Amino acid sequence: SAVPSYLKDYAALYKKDPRAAALQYFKEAKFGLFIHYGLYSLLGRGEWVQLQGKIPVREYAKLENDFTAKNFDADFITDMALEAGMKYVNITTRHHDSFCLFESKYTDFTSTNSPAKRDLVAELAEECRKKGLGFYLYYSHGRDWRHPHAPNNGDWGGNARPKYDSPEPFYKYGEDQDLQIYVEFMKNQITELLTNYGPVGGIWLDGVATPASRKGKLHLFETQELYDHIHSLQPQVLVSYKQGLIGTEDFKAPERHFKGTSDVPLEFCDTLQPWKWGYDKSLDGKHKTADQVMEMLSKANKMDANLLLNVGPLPDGSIHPEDVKTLAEVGRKLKA
């Protein structure tokens, strides 16, 4: 009962150390589904199109007028994962473009506001609770390309913000910018995710390269205070931040591979599309094959790491037919 489904084979440990139970479940899950769905999926040129296309903030915000998510089926997605042999699911609640797939009282730039009128995080959370799958939340942290107070391209690097040819009117600059408005905005949104969707597996932070580009300035993000707020918000939630920003994360989530060894659990995240998370139409017929996934899984076990394998849905919210087959066969090879 109090033991959440995702960690039901670790109840005893849970009734002794909830977070221990979480780490254990995680270190042993081995396989998971990453989902990158958002406004970028409509342009089909990747998830960094706002930057790689220097699309101004206002022009990009017109994509909400075309966001319906008609064929986004959390039932099929949760089922696909299970059959494939995956034990948990991870979705981008809000990427660098700052569009949210969940209802938020601190922004109207959400999928609930859009023609879709749906809380896709709520939809996915229930399907995970129903099916015993772990549920993890990608949330853009070190980079934001919309919020006026988020790191700018002068003070911070990375690629903090799209390098526009004329200053973007939506951004405040210099003295007109107090990151603390942004810092609190994230902490406010993360509070919503941990409260409105029941027990959550972890907060999956991204964008590490930007705060680390000025790491004597790193402390203004109040990141450790964010970790503390997350652990205080629920007993068992984990926090990751790619390979690590301040060293106090519950696990390390490097992209694709990790050199060296780590004090904490490892999770390699990789793509079913060549190089690009997020739907890229130019890559059709070139998605990875079930035999390549077996390699990725093998390599990951060698490294004592999970494999978090990504699907980037089609503009309507449906899973690419190449990835559906690939995952369907990975499941059959695995149960053998």
Side-chain angles (χ1 to χ4, degrees), residues 31-34 86 270-272 293 307-311 327:
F31 202 13
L33 181 72
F34 214 173
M86 297 157 146
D270 216 276
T271 58
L272 261 188
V293 178
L307 167 71
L308 167 65
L309 179 55
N310 171 81
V311 297
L327 293 169

Side-chain angles (χ1 to χ4, degrees), residues 208-278:
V208 84
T210 305
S213 73
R214 307 296 131 73
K215 66 180 183 106
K217 223 183 323 172
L218 199 147
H219 71 268
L220 327 166
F221 273 99
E222 306 204 332
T223 301
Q224 173 60 53
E225 305 65 1
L226 185 64
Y227 293 178
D228 300 345
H229 187 98
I230 298 158
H231 291 125
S232 60
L233 269 206
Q234 302 176 19
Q236 85 304 332
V237 196
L238 303 185
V239 198
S240 54
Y241 206 145
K242 302 296 270 238
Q243 75 262 8
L245 180 72
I246 72 187
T248 64
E249 301 79 9
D250 298 322
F251 60 101
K252 267 170 186 182
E255 282 171 35
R256 314 225 155 68
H257 64 93
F258 192 44
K259 22 263 338 277
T261 83
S262 180
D263 224 274
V264 281
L266 269 310
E267 173 208 64
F268 305 149
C269 46
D270 216 276
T271 58
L272 261 188
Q273 269 178 191
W275 281 117
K276 299 276 201 14
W277 320 72

Side-chain angles (χ1 to χ4, degrees), residues 51-226:
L51 193 136
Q52 309 173 335
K54 280 146 115 196
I55 308 156
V57 171
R58 159 191 173 272
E59 226 203 54
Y60 192 90
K62 304 160 163 225
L63 280 158
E64 176 169 11
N65 315 136
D66 299 293
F67 198 77
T68 81
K70 159 169 230 40
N71 287 117
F72 180 97
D73 192 353
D75 197 1
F76 165 73
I77 288 157
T78 45
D79 273 345
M80 181 178 45
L82 277 177
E83 313 158 21
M86 297 157 146
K87 319 252 192 91
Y88 65 96
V89 164
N90 193 323
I91 182 148
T92 46
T93 72
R94 167 185 144 284
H95 209 275
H96 304 323
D97 68 8
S98 172
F99 185 75
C100 304
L101 313 201
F102 66 104
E103 178 191 277
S104 211
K105 286 341 173 176
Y106 306 122
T107 176
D108 313 280
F109 196 30
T110 83
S111 71
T112 50
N113 214 77
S114 59
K117 303 290 174 199
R118 295 157 69 187
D119 192 325
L120 304 181
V121 169
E123 290 188 29
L124 251 168
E126 165 76 346
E127 286 304 335
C128 281
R129 185 218 90 188
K130 260 160 62 130
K131 297 189 179 101
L133 284 148
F135 192 42
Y136 297 80
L137 312 181
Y138 176 109
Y139 189 86
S140 181
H141 182 276
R143 280 186 278 270
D144 206 307
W145 298 333
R146 208 227 210 203
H147 204 280
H149 303 291
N152 282 44
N153 266 46
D155 324 317
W156 313 79
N159 301 65
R161 289 184 182 288
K163 271 162 224 209
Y164 289 124
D165 295 327
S166 300
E168 158 72 55
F170 200 100
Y171 302 157
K172 260 105 200 184
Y173 296 78
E175 88 254 74
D176 329 302
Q177 241 192 9
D178 172 45
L179 191 64
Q180 294 306 303
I181 304 206
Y182 174 48
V183 169
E184 152 210 10
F185 156 68
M186 315 195 307
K187 178 180 160 180
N188 283 341
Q189 281 206 313
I190 280 166
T191 314
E192 301 186 291
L193 295 171
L194 284 176
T195 48
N196 284 77
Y197 307 96
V200 154
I203 298 297
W204 206 98
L205 298 175
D206 196 20
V208 84
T210 305
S213 73
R214 307 296 131 73
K215 66 180 183 106
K217 223 183 323 172
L218 199 147
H219 71 268
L220 327 166
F221 273 99
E222 306 204 332
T223 301
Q224 173 60 53
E225 305 65 1
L226 185 64

